[PDB]
Amino acid sequence: VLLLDTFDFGPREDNWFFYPGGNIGLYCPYSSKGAPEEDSAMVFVSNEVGEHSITTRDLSVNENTIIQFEINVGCSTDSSSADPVRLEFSRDFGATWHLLLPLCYHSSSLVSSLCSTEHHPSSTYYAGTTQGWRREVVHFGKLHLCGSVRFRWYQGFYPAGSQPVTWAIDNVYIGPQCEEMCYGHGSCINGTKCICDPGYSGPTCKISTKNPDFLKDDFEGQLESDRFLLMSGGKPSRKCGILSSGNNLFFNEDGLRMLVTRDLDLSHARFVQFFMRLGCGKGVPDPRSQPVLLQYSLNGGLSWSLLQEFLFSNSSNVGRYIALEMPLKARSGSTRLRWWQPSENGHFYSPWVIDQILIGGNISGNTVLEDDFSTLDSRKWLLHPGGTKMPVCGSTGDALVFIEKASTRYVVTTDIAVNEDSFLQIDFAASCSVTDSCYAIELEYSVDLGLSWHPLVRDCLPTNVECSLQRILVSDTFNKWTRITLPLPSYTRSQATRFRWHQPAPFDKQQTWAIDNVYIGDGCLDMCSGHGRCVQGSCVCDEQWGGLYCDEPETSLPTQLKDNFNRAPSNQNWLTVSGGKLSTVCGAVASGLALHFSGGCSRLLVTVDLNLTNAEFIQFYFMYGCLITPSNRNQGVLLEYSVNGGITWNLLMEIFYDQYSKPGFVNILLPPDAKEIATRFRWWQPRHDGLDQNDWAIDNVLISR
Ligand SMILES: *[C@@H]1O[C@H](CO)[C@@H](O[C@@H]2O[C@H](CO)[C@@H](O[C@@H]3O[C@H](CO)[C@@H](O)[C@H](O)[C@@H]3O)[C@H](O)[C@H]2NC(C)=O)[C@H](O)[C@H]1NC(C)=O
Ligand SMILES: *[C@@H]1O[C@H](CO)[C@@H](O[C@@H]2O[C@H](CO)[C@@H](O)[C@H](O)[C@H]2NC(C)=O)[C@H](O)[C@H]1NC(C)=O
Ligand SMILES: *[C@@H]1O[C@H](CO)[C@@H](O)[C@H](O)[C@H]1NC(C)=O
Ligand SMILES: *[C@@H]1O[C@H](CO)[C@@H](O)[C@H](O)[C@H]1NC(C)=O
Ligand SMILES: [Ca+2]
Ligand SMILES: [Ca+2]
Ligand SMILES: [Ca+2]
Ligand SMILES: [Ca+2]
Ligand SMILES: [Zn+2]
Ligand SMILES: [Zn+2]
Numbered sequence: 001v002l003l004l005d006t007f008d009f010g011p012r013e014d015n016w017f018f019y020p021g022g023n024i025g026l027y028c029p030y031s032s033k034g035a036p037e038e039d040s041a042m043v044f045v046s047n048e049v050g051e052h053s054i055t056t057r058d059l060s061v062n063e064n065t066i067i068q069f070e071i072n073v074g075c076s077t078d079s080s081s082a083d084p085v086r087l088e089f090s091r092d093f094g095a096t097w098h099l100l101l102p103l104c105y106h107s108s109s110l111v112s113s114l115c116s117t118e119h120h121p122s123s124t125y126y127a128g129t130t131q132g133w134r135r136e137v138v139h140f141g142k143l144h145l146c147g148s149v150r151f152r153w154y155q156g157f158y159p160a161g162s163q164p165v166t167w168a169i170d171n172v173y174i175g176p177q178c179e180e181m182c183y184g185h186g187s188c189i190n191g192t193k194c195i196c197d198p199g200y201s202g203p204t205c206k207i208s209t210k211n212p213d214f215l216k217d218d219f220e221g222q223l224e225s226d227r228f229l230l231m232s233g234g235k236p237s238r239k240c241g242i243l244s245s246g247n248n249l250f251f252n253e254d255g256l257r258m259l260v261t262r263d264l265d266l267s268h269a270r271f272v273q274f275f276m277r278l279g280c281g282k283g284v285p286d287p288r289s290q291p292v293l294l295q296y297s298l299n300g301g302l303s304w305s306l307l308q309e310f311l312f313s314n315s316s317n318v319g320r321y322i323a324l325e326m327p328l329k330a331r332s333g334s335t336r337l338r339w340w341q342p343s344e345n346g347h348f349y350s351p352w353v354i355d356q357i358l359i360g361g362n363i364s365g366n367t368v369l370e371d372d373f374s375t376l377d378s379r380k381w382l383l384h385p386g387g388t389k390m391p392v393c394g395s396t397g398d399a400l401v402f403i404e405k406a407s408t409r410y411v412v413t414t415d416i417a418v419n420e421d422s423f424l425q426i427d428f429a430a431s432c433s434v435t436d437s438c439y440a441i442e443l444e445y446s447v448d449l450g451l452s453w454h455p456l457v458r459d460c461l462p463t464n465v466e467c468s469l470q471r472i473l474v475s476d477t478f479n480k481w482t483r484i485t486l487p488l489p490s491y492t493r494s495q496a497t498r499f500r501w502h503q504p505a506p507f508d509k510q511q512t513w514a515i516d517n518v519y520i521g522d523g524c525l526d527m528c529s530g531h532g533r534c535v536q537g538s539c540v541c542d543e544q545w546g547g548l549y550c551d552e553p554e555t556s557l558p559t560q561l562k563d564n565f566n567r568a569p570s571n572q573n574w575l576t577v578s579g580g581k582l583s584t585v586c587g588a589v590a591s592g593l594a595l596h597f598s599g600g601c602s603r604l605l606v607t608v609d610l611n612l613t614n615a616e617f618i619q620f621y622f623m624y625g626c627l628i629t630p631s632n633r634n635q636g637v638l639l640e641y642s643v644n645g646g647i648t649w650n651l652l653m654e655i656f657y658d659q660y661s662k663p664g665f666v667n668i669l670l671p672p673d674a675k676e677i678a679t680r681f682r683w684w685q686p687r688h689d690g691l692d693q694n695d696w697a698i699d700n701v702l703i704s705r
Contacts (some may be wrong), residue, residue: 001191002059002175003057003059003174004058004635006038006171007024007042007170007171008328009215010024010217011024015057015683016054017094018053018625019053020051021051021155022043024040026039027166028133031132040158041070042333042437043168044168044376045166046163046165048158049158049162051156051157052164052167053155053510055152057150059233060149061148062140063143064177064191065140065176065177066139066174066175066181067087067138067172067173068170068187069136069153069173070135071125071134071168071169072133073127073128074127074128074165075131075166077613078374079127079233079253079254079255079256081257081347083156084124084414085155086099086124087123087124087138087151087153088123088153089149089150089151093150094150095330098126099122100123100143101143102115103120104116105119110359111236117262118291118303120580121256121258121340123167124252124346125167126308128255129232129255131232137184139177139302145404149173153584168515171187171658174517175188178191178192178193178204178599181302183200183299184297184301186200186204187192189227189505190360195570197300207336208263208540212262212264213264213362215261216357216359217249217357218246220247226262227262228259229262230260232255232256233251233253233258234259235251235252235253235497236250237249237250239250239252240280242355243355243385244407249353251353251354254346257343258340259339261336263332263335263336266332267332269330269359269361269362269364269666270345271281271325271332272324272358272413273357274356276292276353277318278313279312279317279326279352280351281350289313290312290342290348292309292339292340292342293342294307294308294338294339295337295338295340297336297338298330304338305329321682323636324449326361337359341464352397361414361415361496362415365417367417367418367419367422367521368467368519368520369520371518372397372516372517373400374397377566379414382412383411386396386406386410390403392429392512393512394480395637396455396517398484399427400514401512401514402512406421406509408505410500410502410503411500412498413498413500413520416496417521418498420493422493422521423485423486424485424520425442425515425517425527426483426484427516427599428473428514428515429478430478431510431511431513432480433479435510437508439475439571440471440472441502441513442500442502442503443472443498443500443502444456444500446499447496449496453500453502455470456489456492456499457470462649463651464651465633466634466686466687474601475513476579476602484521487648488520497504501513504624519533523538525536526549528541529551530644532545532549550702557608557609557610558611559572559614560610560615561610561611561704562704563700563702565592565594567699575607575680576606576682577595578604578605579597579600580603581596585626585698586663587626589699590621590700594623596626596695597698598693599683600691603685603688603696605682607703609678610678610679611679612679613677614705615703617669617670617703617704618639618668618701618702619665619701619703620666620699620700620701621663621666622692622699623661623663623696624657624659624664625659628694629658630658630688631657631689634673634687635686636655636657636685636686637684637685637695638653640650640681641682643673645680646680650673652671653666655696
């Protein structure tokens with residue numbers, strides 16, 4: 001043991017050669033977790049004239065020597081490069097001095113350097129790095145420091161009228177390291193004893209209480225939390241924004257720029273993701289701008305490994321979504337991450353912003369994500385700009401609702417494993433008759449942690465006239481709460497697929513929407529037959545439906561359907577009528593009124609489910625172009641049937657676009673697989689040129705024998 005001083009008496013006389021400007025006292029004690037009696041420290045107050053520093057006697061050091069101490073510079077978060085404290089050593093009895101730990105980033109080959117692979121700041125302690133005291137430890141193993149050396153904490157020389165930042169040090173230990181360096185979770189005493197930090201225990205502070213397996217900061221909440229151990233140089237701001245609403249964390253000061261997380265349980269973590277903007281101006285960022293380094297530590301910050309360097313470039317000055325998979329080596333019960341932008345002097349050439357930090361996920365193979373939105377769990381719903389947990393449109397409890405004024409509206413799920421048995425099933429609503437606007441909400445998937453998003457359902461006509469997104473969540477058909485069930489296509493299969501509901505900008509405030517009763521997974525069977533919802537691996541049937549998978553009607557289905565369309569379409573015959581209304585515009589199609597589809601949005605007609613086991617035919621009268629004739633083949637109405645409650649459809653007839661300029665009669669013999677105990681029909685027009693364009697009419701439907 002070479003040197004120990006707690007300053008709790010006064011200073012130990014033999015320890016120190018000099019301490020100009022230093023006086024025993026208290027500095028910034030009220031955050032400190034240490035005992036009150038221990039708060040006595042060596043303080044260097046701003047107004048002291050002359051040198052501000054403290055120098056040790058000459059000591060004999062070796063590769064196993066550490067310097068360990070606690071420091072507070074400035075008792076604030078007002079970050080500054082002015083008058084930092086430098087920890088230095090001298091090999092010539094104080095004639096010359098050098099930083100004990102150099103700044104290590106990318107070293108020149110023209111010079112002698114001790115830096116190796118690990119990127120780290122120097123033993124320089126800047127004002128406004130943190131309000132709290134902190135422990136620093138420097139190990140000599142890498143420093144080629146052996147023999148007689150003296151050390152100093154040095155700030156500067158200050159004439160009268162100077163006002164450098166006040167600082168203080170405490171609990172200085174210089175001597176042999178402790179075993180395992182106390183795993184970076186304790187203070188070493190004499191190399192023989194570890195004094196463990198809270199939540200760490202045992203001889204070497206190896207054993208940890210469980211750490212959280214998830215971190216979120218959107219910077220809309222508190223800036224003092226258990227989430228970050230350091231937030232040096234970052235302030236909440238709306239400047240240099242990335243997202244359309246809310247604060248970001250903004251680095252626009254000098255000194256240290258370093259954001260350090262608490263220790264996390266990342267043993268099953270999949271990802272770190274965040275938004276970042278490197279540079280805030282219209283031109284190209286200054287080429288001297290130093291990169292933001294993302295690093296991790298397994299040992300309480302004793303050593304750091306690189307995840308990614310993010311360089312300033314001609315394109316970096318636009319907000320960007322960033323996501324990385326958590327590598328195996330970073331996955332432990334106790335891993336912290338940091339974002340650090342190096343600088344040799346505490347000066348920076350550009351600001352930067354970070355926002356919406358999420359760390360977590362789960363690599364253990366989970367195949368199910370479900371929610372009724374009784375709560376909004378951040379671990380399941382990663383991003384939801386514009387979205388609020390609240391009731392709307394007579395929802396079952398709360399829903400996730402996009403109603404407030406916003407420039408961005410989307411919601412992203414966490415990742416799940418998707419396989420051949422996977423399906424997506426949600427309730428969705430648009431504006432609930434608040435607006436009559438025609439709009440759609442995109443449903444998308446990513447297999448790369450949100451780096452790219454692709455439409456879940458592709459434009460693919462069963463006629464193969466058009467094939468390559470298909471608008472599904474549309475505001476007329478889904479005006480009020482409506483269920484959709486989609487088998488997940490092969491291209492979505494992976495061990496980590498996530499989903500996004502996206503309202504592309506620009507959109508109007510009144511074009512609102514919501515989701516509820518979400519199930520994405522491979523449970524239940526038959527996707528509940530179109531007549532129920534999967535809840536915790538069990539089908540919950542709609543009213544009037546029963547059986548294990550909701551395939552059994554409580555009351556016998558009709559065996560025929562007939563409609564002359566001389567009265568308003570009835571829910572006894574029709575489940576859906578969008579874009580169609582009874583009129584005489586077509587003349588007689590069969591007779592009197594016809595159901596005329598000329599709406600500017602969806603044009604869709606769906607029957608109730610029918611028992612067609614013994615039925616023989618479907619027939620109807622049909623006309624195109626009562627107003628404007630269809631201009632191409634993809635505008636042909638498709639007649640399809642479903643035997644699974646509208647989940648999947650089978651083409652029966654393409655009602656060819658350039659036919660039926662005069663009313664015609666269609667008579668089709670039902671195929672075997674359309675003759676089931678529960679089957680529905682739909683007429684839908686995949687494309688049209690809008691209101692009163694490429695219109696069609698139907699009359700005298702008969703599905704019978
Ligand atoms: C699906 O629909 C078929 C009809 O195509 C149903 O089969 C029919 O079931 C009814 C019972 O409600 C039987 O009706 C009875 O017919 C006798 C004939 O003399 C009459 O005396 C009774 O008063 C009554 O009307 C009918 O025989 C039978 N037809 C056939 C071809 O079997 C069937 O029940 C339906 N399936 C499901 C799953 O509900
Ligand atoms: C990570 O995901 C896995 C899912 O594979 C979770 O482990 C399951 O947890 C539930 C508890 O409700 C059990 O019913 C399963 O039997 C567990 N399976 C396995 C393989 O252990 C795990 O809980 C998730 N981690 C966290 C912390 O949420
Ligand atoms: C550490 O060594 C110093 C030598 O000055 C001694 O005063 C102190 O009691 C020792 N501490 C422990 C806990 O061994
Ligand atoms: C970015 O801008 C600088 C100066 O405007 C230019 O010289 C440089 O080549 C640009 N970078 C790239 C790769 O386009
Ligand atoms: Ca003390
Ligand atoms: Ca934010
Ligand atoms: Ca709900
Ligand atoms: Ca009619
Ligand atoms: Zn590097
Ligand atoms: Zn999109």
